[PDB]
Write a protein that binds this ligand. Structure first.
Ligand code: HEC
Ligand code: HEC
Length: 171
């Protein structure tokens, strides 16, 4: 159990890339605001011990205690993710995939598990990178099941671009 109030100051070093409140202004860096505390904490441990490699964060988590990480996670989880706009040329394809999946190819809809990390409002650039990394097996911290890797295997590049654009505007 983290202390959100204590996490705010401990999160100051993170704001340079993720935003003071976790709402990053630049699309390369993911928004952390409003993300689930348990998801955030798991990603922090995965990044810290190398199960998920984020070279841009090398050395930042090294000296944070497990309590420090829980406080920071609690702080970001207490914020609210800001919501962007979808591209009108892509949003229909992206929303149809998000709500309906690809029934023909046995791909479940995203709404089954993602309303679990929060997705709605996340930068499209960041989401597309994660879906592509999942598909290519470069991100592998999705458990022994490899659910996201198996799901992203069914998405084309056009699918990923459209779903990512839809998610960016989702609220
Ligand atoms: C830029 C120099 C960063 C600073 C300072 C911090 N983070 Fe970071 N973080 C950065 C990038 C480029 C990425 C994404 C890499 C990729 O997969 O494309 C991240 C990612 C995270 C995550 C994962 C978020 C998710 O949605 O899965 C977390 C939990 C995270 N970062 C936490 C975190 C904390 C706690 C920081 C302060 C100590 C911090 N980051 C600083 C870049 C940068
Ligand atoms: C349940 C079986 C899921 C379905 C169906 C989909 N996703 Fe998923 N996703 C799931 C989990 C359990 C996780 C967390 C993995 C971890 O590293 O612990 C994820 C993760 C994502 C992410 C990364 C989020 C982040 O902040 O980096 C994205 C972008 C994502 N999932 C997207 C996504 C889409 C577009 C889906 C439908 C096509 C979808 N997921 C299905 C669980 C499940």
């Amino acid at each position: 159990a983290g202390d959100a109030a204590a996490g705010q100051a401990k999160a100051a070093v993170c704001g340079a890339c993720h935003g003071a409140d976790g709402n990053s202004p630049a699309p390369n860096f993911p928004k952390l605001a409003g993300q689930g505390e348990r998801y955030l904490l798991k990603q922090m441990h995965d990044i810290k011990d190398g199960k998920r490699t984020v070279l841009e964060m090398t050395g930042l988590l090294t000296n944070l205690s497990d309590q420090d990480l829980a406080d920071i996670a609690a702080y970001f989880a207490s914020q609210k993710m800001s919501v962007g706009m979808a591209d009108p040329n892509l949003v229909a394809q992206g929303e149809a995939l998000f709500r309906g999946g690809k029934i023909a190819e046995g791909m479940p809809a995203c709404t089954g598990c993602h309303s679990f990390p929060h997705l709605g409002g996340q930068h499209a650039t960041y989401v597309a990178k994660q879906l592509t990394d999942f598909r290519e097996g470069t991100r592998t911290n999705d458990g022994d099941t490899k659910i996201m890797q198996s799901i992203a295997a069914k998405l084309s590049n056009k699918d990923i671009a459209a779903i990512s654009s839809y998610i960016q505007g989702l609220h």
